[PDB]
């Protein structure tokens, strides 16, 4: 069978916590009063929830209400417990309340309101500095959650709220997040296709915080190269092919060998033989102003097959890409 794996960092953070911290199945949900909120306008629907701007009638405060679509008690408890454990951490969305929505008979999560600009409009306006700055802000949230024993498992533009005017960022949507326990075999059916790590695509279950760093690298590539998505697969199998056309097949097969991974037989014909491509292949007149040696070196060190080889959040924050931003924030 496959060779086991452990996180390089924060390996045993949960092992030393009280059981209650990570044992979300045991959590008893603390309900507030649904009548404290009035819905104002619908912001969007997902597979898992519908989101509204709302108002707390008592405090006259703007809030956001996420009405949960029906999922197992355990899934709701996991998201609640994680949000509560992380509350107040850097750039983590603040869970203000949990209420019972009367019509749905489902829970509703009540969050702080972020004055977000839709990424589809914002990302084109972002300068070189802006990308560095917001990447650093995401890394603060990821280092925090990782240090707290939690994997996000769904890092993507949709889940990063940016109030541009205030240079304010929040990481949202902890509905897929999980506690890291060394040796645990996780569900590979997580995250969004274009951002899935190689570990997920080859069905390597003993993954860790490093998954988030692959997803982040996918985001960085899409931003600096003006290419959304960066890895555009048609399906889950083709997704690995798209990655292999860039990172090359030699390193892919090296990863599979190192972990003794059993490759799905579907994969063989389509995978072929591909060189590792130079990042400069993706540079053009429209994106060159965003691309530096620094940016490419950093990206190279996130987008690695071998989860153990990728930069940590904490390592990434020390990269030369960020020297200007670190200086400007100690102003
Ligand atoms: C869609 C569009 C980009 C037009 O709208 C927006 O910009 N949207 C909704 C995001 O849609 C998501 C559903 O599809 C705004 C707007 C303001 N705020 N303030 C806080 C949030 C917020 C906070 C927490 C969660 C959570 O999931 O835990 C959450 O989903 C959202 C927010 N979301």
CATH code where residue 103 lies: 3.30.200.20
- The verdict on 154 and 224 lying in the same domain is yes
DSSP state of 194: G
The alpha carbon of 134 is separated from its chain's Cα centroid by a whole number of angstroms, namely 14
Q: How many CB atoms lie within 10 A of CB 316?
A: 24
The structure was resolved experimentally with X-ray
- The verdict on 189 and 51 lying in the same domain is no
- The verdict on 49 and 149 lying in the same domain is no
**For residues 12, 16, 20 and 21, what is the CA-based torsion angle, rounded to 10 degrees?**
-50
109 Cα nearest atom in ligand 1: 28
Last residue of a domain, one of 62, 80, 113: 113
Q: Is 222 buried (19+), middle (13-18) or exposed (0-12) by CB count in 10 A?
A: buried
CA–CA separation, 31 and 306 (whole Å)? 42
Q: How many CB atoms lie within 10 A of CB 252?
A: 23
CA–CA separation, 322 and 132 (whole Å)? 6
CATH number of the domain that residue 283 is part of: 1.10.510.10
Which contacts of 251-258 are long-range, i.e. CB under 8 A and separated by 24 or more positions?
251/276, 251/304, 251/305, 251/306, 252/198, 252/305, 254/305, 254/306, 255/198, 255/202, 255/305, 255/306, 256/202, 258/3, 258/306
Sign of CA dihedral 149, 20, 186, 78: negative
- The verdict on 135 and 246 lying in the same domain is yes
Query: Could you tell me the resolution of this structure in angstroms?
Result: 2.8
149: left (phi over 0), alpha (psi -120 to 50) or beta: left
- The verdict on 123 and 210 lying in the same domain is yes
Last residue of a domain, one of 86, 113, 140: 113
- The verdict on 309 and 265 lying in the same domain is yes
CA–CA separation, 76 and 29 (whole Å)? 9
CA–CA separation, 176 and 75 (whole Å)? 8
User: How many domains does the chain contain in total?
Assistant: 2
- Cβ-contact 95, 64 below 8 angstroms: no
- The verdict on 287 and 199 lying in the same domain is yes
Q: How many CB atoms lie within 10 A of CB 176?
A: 21
Length of the chain: 331
**Best substitution site from 39, 64, 95, 170 to test ligand 1's pocket, by max atoms within 8 Å of Cβ?**
64
Residues of the domain holding 277: 5-22+114-327
- The verdict on 97 and 9 lying in the same domain is no
316 C-beta closer than 6 A to ligand 1: no
- The verdict on 162 and 282 lying in the same domain is yes
């Amino acid at each position: 069978g496959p060779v086991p794996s452990r996180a390089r960092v924060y390996t045993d953070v949960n092992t030393h916590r009280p059981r209650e911290y990570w044992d979300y199945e045991s959590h008893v949900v603390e309900w507030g009063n649904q009548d404290d909120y009035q819905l104002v306008r619908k912001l969007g629907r997902g597979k898992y929830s519908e989101v509204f701007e709302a108002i707390n009638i008592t405090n006259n405060e703007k809030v956001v209400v996420k009405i949960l679509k029906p999922v197992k008690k355990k899934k709701i408890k996991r998201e609640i417990k994680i949000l509560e454990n992380l509350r107040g951490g850097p750039n983590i969305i603040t869970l203000a309340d949990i209420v019972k929505d009367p019509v749905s008979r489902t829970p509703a999560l009540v969050f702080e309101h972020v004055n977000n600009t839709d990424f589809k409009q914002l990302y084109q306006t972002l300068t070189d500095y802006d990308i560095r700055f917001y990447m650093y802000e995401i890394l603060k949230a990821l280092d925090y959650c990782h240090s707290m024993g939690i994997m996000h498992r769904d890092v993507k533009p949709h889940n990063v709220m940016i109030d541009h005017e205030h240079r304010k960022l929040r990481l949202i949507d902890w509905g897929l997040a999980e506690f890291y326990h060394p040796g645990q075999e996780y569900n590979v059916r997580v995250a969004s296709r274009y951002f899935k790590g190689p570990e997920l695509l080859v069905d390597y279950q003993m993954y860790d915080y490093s998954l988030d760093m692959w997803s982040l690298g996918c985001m960085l590539a899409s931003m600096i190269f003006r290419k959304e998505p960066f890895f555009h697969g048609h399906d889950n199998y083709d997704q690995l092919v798209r990655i292999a056309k860039v990172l090359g097949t030699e390193d892919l097969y090296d990863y599979i060998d190192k972990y003794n991974i059993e490759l799905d037989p579907r994969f063989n014909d389509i995978l072929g033989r591909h060189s590792r491509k130079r990042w400069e292949r993706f540079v053009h007149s429209e994106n060159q102003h965003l691309v530096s040696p620094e940016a490419l070196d950093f990206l190279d060190k996130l987008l690695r097959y071998d989860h153990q080889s990728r930069l940590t959040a904490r390592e990434a924050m020390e990269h030369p890409y960020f020297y200007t931003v670190v200086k400007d924030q100690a102003r």
